[PDB]
């Protein structure tokens, strides 16, 4: 399976955008938490199908598949978000009709901080001019790197090889190919950090009762 075929496969596996409507009235603490959670819950369902289409994922023991997904689900959601918001500086497109402003993040205690990281990291990606093909590889690396064990390593290298092949097909000098590879991957940490703050926040909001945490969304939250 050449790098290009892996990319082509990841491009087909892209899940369809989940359509969720923004509440009629101006957001309240709850209406926002229920929007974000409803959207996340629906996306998790698609994420699981998506993961089963990543070459060789289904060949891992069930236990590993569960550990990878419980470990990276929020990162994947955030990476998806950042990509959907890439051509809209200042905005976070959680969905077609749910285009949150940075300021709307005030009707919820402590979410502005999380929104800022997302916007910060997104701007970095925008600045690097992240390409669709690079994005496909990166998102899959997030899932395969949240880390049968030897089969996961060859899976991660396979996708790494693809990202390397995609960047190489841009024509920038070999030196700049390495620099871009480095610049893109350094951002993975930021995504992992945001995921951490975001999940801690979410668990908090669940303890507050501020919003009902669905069955699948709760399983993932707890891991």
């Amino acid at each position: 399976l050449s790098p290009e075929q892996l990319v082509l496969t990841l491009l087909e596996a892209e899940p369809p955008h989940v359509l969720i409507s923004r509440p009629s009235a101006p957001f309240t603490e709850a209406s926002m938490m229920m929007s974000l959670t409803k959207l996340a819950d629906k996306e998790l369902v698609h994420m699981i199908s998506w993961a089963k289409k990543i070459p060789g994922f289904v060949e891992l023991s069930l236990f590993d598949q569960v550990r990878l997904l419980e470990s990276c689900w929020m990162e994947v959601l955030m990476m998806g978000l950042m990509w959907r918001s890439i051509d809209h500086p200042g905005k976070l497109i959680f969905a077609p009709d749910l285009v949150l402003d940075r300021d709307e993040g005030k009707c919820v205690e402590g979410i502005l901080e999380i929104f800022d990281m997302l916007l910060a990291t997104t701007s970095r990606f925008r600045e690097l001019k992240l390409q669709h093909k690079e994005y496909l590889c990166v998102k899959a690396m997030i899932l395969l790197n949240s880390s049968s064990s030897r089969k996961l390593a060859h899976l991660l290298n396979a996708v790494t090889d693809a990202l390397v092949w995609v960047i190489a097909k841009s024509g920038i000098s070999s030196q700049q190919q390495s620099m871009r590879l480095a610049n893109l991957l350094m951002l993975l940490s930021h995504v992992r950090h945001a995921s951490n703050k975001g999940m801690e926040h979410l668990l908090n909001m669940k303890c507050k009762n501020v919003v009902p945490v669905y069955d699948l969304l709760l399983e993932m939250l707890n891991a």
């Binding site: 369902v45 699981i48 199908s49 069930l62 569960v66 997904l69 419980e70 699948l216 399983e219």
Partner: peptide
């Protein structure tokens, strides 16, 4: 439920 989606569907 997570295990269901991964194996059941």
């Amino acid at each position: 439920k997570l295990v269901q989606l991964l194996t059941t569907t």
